[PDB]
Design a protein around this ligand. Structure first.
Ligand code: NA
Length: 121
């Protein structure tokens, strides 16, 4: 149907917008702390601590399968990146502080993304 097609075109345009968002977020992480999964072969106890690991590469894979139906879903995954880091690592560490800074800077990006998604429909 043509109604199904129109829904598909909308999902594709949201995907495009969320790609630009993901690139902007990732530019706020020049050290590439959040780029890839934590290796279970180097924080071997990681999964006893953190139940739902997340990273930017994992988000990109979901994005390319048009796997985010709305901005809220994408935001949840970004918040897992930040939140997991703030739990596993202590307040005094470079990792925790990098997560605080990424959350602050990503706030700006996400705030406009919401206005654009709302505005475009
Ligand atoms: Na902690």
């Amino acid at each position: 149907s043509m109604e199904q097609v129109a829904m598909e075109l909308r999902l594709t345009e949201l995907t495009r917008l969320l790609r630009s968002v993901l690139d902007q977020l990732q530019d706020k992480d020049p050290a590439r702390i959040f780029a890839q999964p934590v290796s279970l072969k180097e924080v071997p106890d990681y999964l006893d601590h953190i139940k739902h690991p997340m990273d930017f590469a994992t988000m990109r894979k979901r994005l390319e399968a048009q796997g985010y139906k709305n901005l809220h879903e994408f935001e949840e995954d970004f918040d897992l990146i930040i939140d997991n880091c703030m739990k596993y690592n202590a307040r005094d560490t470079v990792f925790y502080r990098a997560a605080v800074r990424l959350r602050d800077q990503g706030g700006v990006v996400l705030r406009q993304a919401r206005r654009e998604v709302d505005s475009i429909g």
